[PDB]
Design a protein around this ligand. Structure first.
Ligand SMILES: Cc1ncc(COP(=O)(O)O)c(CNC[C@H]2O[C@H](O[C@H]3[C@H](O)[C@@H](O)[C@H](N)C[C@@H]3N)[C@H](N)[C@@H](O)[C@@H]2O)c1O
Ligand SMILES: Cc1ncc(COP(=O)(O)O)c(CNC[C@H]2O[C@H](O[C@H]3[C@H](O)[C@@H](O)[C@H](N)C[C@@H]3N)[C@H](N)[C@@H](O)[C@@H]2O)c1O
Ligand SMILES: [Cl-]
Lengths: 409, 409
């Protein structure tokens, strides 16, 4: 207990972190020698697979100084910028050292550029205190952030006074929000004349070789990170020259560190082909068909939201959800507990076959829960909240919305 | 023109970044094949030297999968936390992705833990807007920060109402502030009952295996970064468990990324022994003896502040400053222009012998500046302001302090 932070990671029954010695492709080794198949994948930042051979060679080389120096510019800086710009659009691009740092810099630049105070937010934007919850729903926090919890009725209300709004900033979820959700969000922002920031730290580059919301939102500013460097310490922002002009005041010491630029340039190259995204979709979709039949044949009341790119178990009770991850653990399948499961491209037939096999065995372990009452909406809203930090799309009136927020906050 | 940021880096006479294609030890090669001896060394974060073989090999093995996974905890997390704790003291340790992020998190944690609004600051703390200047000297900015510019007179004033003060946060400079200055700062903060945060992002682990101000300040909370990983993207905060409890709320996606953890463990192993810091001190002091002698023999009105660990040229005039770096640029000595020079442990006998010959050539180019009026205090103040973003220690009354602030802000 030297560690001052509480990092999100695999934890065991005593909530102590699982210690992993090694990993390659889709497989992990733990400290007891027990081997796992990884559906966490550093929260979906491992798009390609652990230890990816070709990224590894580019990073190993950069470490020797052969591609440049942390002292200053290298043409790999130009290549990473150029790639991102091609993939995501906009006029300008900036690089940062986490998703957190990127989203904060982007929204503060917009606030400065527009001269307006309030940020209207849905979703998680990172650990920084600027995003901490207000004393009550719909009121601005200490840093001028109002959370609207992906409720478009609440957003529409807020946008009836757009003079005070620097930007709307949204973290997509494609498991729990439909395409028409996003189009309504875009229509409302455009009618109000308000800047739209897509926080694609998680979803950017994974659904497509580009922004998952490039056409759905056509955002004024974007942020990506998890998809861009197979796990390495980099994020990016882009959009219009005028709104990001304040980013000119950003500099940081490690900006030119070559191994990160190596990893980003290698990983982005594949990202740009479409293939790893196809492979993950196709692979996790295979695994999903299989998992859904196994839960069904087993009479287990667990729905699965989403798709091969990201999916989430939605069990009918919290008891069952815990048992589920209990059994998965017992079988060497590493899920990100309660959150979204994101396979990597290292999910070939061998892995899929074993994972399917290990999932059947999870269903076997779970047979005491066979025939429980099927999934209701309270479970769906609970489980979606854990992944999105706000409300899944479903029909509701204002009273229902208010009740949900009271319950879940 | 894709980059939205304006990174600090070596820039040519047209203000364009120099392009470096490779580096090894003390030496850089640029896009034209010109070879440079590096005194900038990623703003001092390259303590060991470019492409340090042991670190590079730690990084290579970690990029394979064989030395931990981004998905979660590893034995190298413990080794890093343990090492920092041993070198720097305190009860807990936290890891971050840049000095900016680390100092922001540290100070916000102290603000939350004490419950008091104001941060009293000297020095540079990172690019974040929380540090932007106030409307007037001695007024807090919009984020509750009041800059005292290293003037203990001004600090005493601000310490007259300490109930409102969460911390004093200071970035040391050992070229322009004496040991007695630190002791008095220490005294002051203790009498006022205020928390002292030493921002050792630059100086930590470089003057000694641990904190430069360990004895002088005995700070409540410390921050280090540039010393810990031979340029790789990590920083650390440590100190009181109580004061850093708010850091429990920190998590980021790349926390377990293995190449950075390996680089840090390998670098900190070397740092703990005291050897690289001794090598740097001795190598730099040797260069300084030669440089001071060459300047004097040439009748050039340029002093040198500092020592082998970090030194700064202090030219009598801005014209002569620009001529100095122009001449150094022509001879392939890469100085961090106007700022501090920080050699690495790869500065061996052969590097020093060539740097001496190059600096002799520099002084020959500056012949036309021979015999100019000797350095005055206005020059010393302007030059020191560039490295510390505040006032070098020297006798002043308040009016003169005020006067300097008006001049240099
Ligand atoms: C849209 C978005 N914007 C910025 C960030 C910050 O990026 P970074 O971690 O690099 O600083 C993330 C980081 N994502 C990590 C996790 O964040 C969320 O998890 C939060 C979680 O939802 C929240 O309730 C809890 N307080 C902490 C936890 N880290 C998501 N539910 C999860 O799918 C994600 O994997 C993000 O998803
Ligand atoms: C004490 C301290 N705390 C946090 C940080 C931020 O760390 P990071 O860059 O990793 O985010 C630094 C970063 N240091 C980089 C430079 O910062 C200052 O340079 C500033 C410079 O003084 C300032 O005027 C300018 N606007 C930006 C410039 N980077 C120092 N003069 C220099 O010696 C340094 O090498 C630091 O020195
Ligand atoms: Cl003083």
């Amino acid at each position: 207990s030297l560690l001052a932070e509480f990092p999100t990671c695999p934890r065991d029954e005593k909530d102590r972190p699982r210690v992993f010695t090694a990993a390659s492709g889709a497989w992990l080794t733990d400290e007891s020698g027990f081997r796992w198949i990884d559906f966490d994948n550093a929260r979906g930042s491992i798009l390609l697979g652990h230890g990816d051979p070709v990224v590894a060679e580019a990073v190993a080389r950069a470490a020797t100084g052969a591609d440049g120096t942390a002292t200053g510019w290298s043409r790999r800086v130009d290549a990473v910028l150029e790639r991102l710009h091609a993939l995501c659009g906009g006029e300008v691009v900036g690089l940062f050292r986490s998703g957190t740092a990127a989203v904060r810099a982007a929204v503060l630049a917009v606030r400065e550029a527009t001269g307006r105070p309030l940020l209207l937010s849905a979703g998680y934007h990172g650990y920084d205190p600027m995003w901490y919850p207000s004393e009550a729903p719909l009121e601005p926090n200490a840093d001028g952030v109002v959370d609207f919890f992906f409720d478009l009725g609440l957003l529409r209300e807020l946008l009836r006074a757009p003079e005070r709004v620097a930007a709307v900033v949204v973290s997509p979820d494609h498991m729990h929000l439909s395409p028409g959700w996003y189009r309504e969000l875009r229509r409302l922002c455009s009618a109000a004349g308000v800047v739209l920031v897509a926080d694609e730290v998680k979803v950017g580059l994974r659904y497509a070789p580009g922004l998952s919301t490039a056409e759905l939102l056509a955002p004024d500013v974007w942020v990506v990170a998890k998809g861009m460097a197979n796990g390495h310490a980099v994020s990016a922002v882009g959009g219009s020259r005028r709104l990001l002009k304040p980013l000119k005041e950003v500099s940081f010491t490690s900006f030119f560190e070559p191994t990160i630029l190596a990893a980003a340039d290698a990983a982005l190259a594949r990202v740009a082909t479409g293939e790893p995204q196809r492979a993950v979709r196709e692979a996790g979709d295979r695994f999903l068909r299989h998992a859904r039949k196994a839960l069904d044949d087993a009479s287990l009341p667990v729905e699965i939201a989403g798709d091969g790119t990201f999916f989430q178990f939605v069990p009918a009770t919290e008891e069952l959800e815990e048992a589920l991850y209990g059994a998965a653990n017992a079988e060497g399948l590493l899920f990100y507990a309660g959150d979204n499961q994101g396979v990597s491209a290292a999910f070939d037939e061998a892995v899929l076959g074993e994972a399917e096999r290990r999932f059947a065995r999870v269903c076997e372990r779970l047979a005491p829960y066979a025939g429980g009452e099927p999934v209701g909406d309270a479970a769906r809203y609970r489980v979606a909240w854990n992944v999105m930090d706000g409300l899944r799309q479903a029909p509701r009136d204002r009273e229902e919305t208010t009740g949900l927020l009271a319950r879940l906050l």
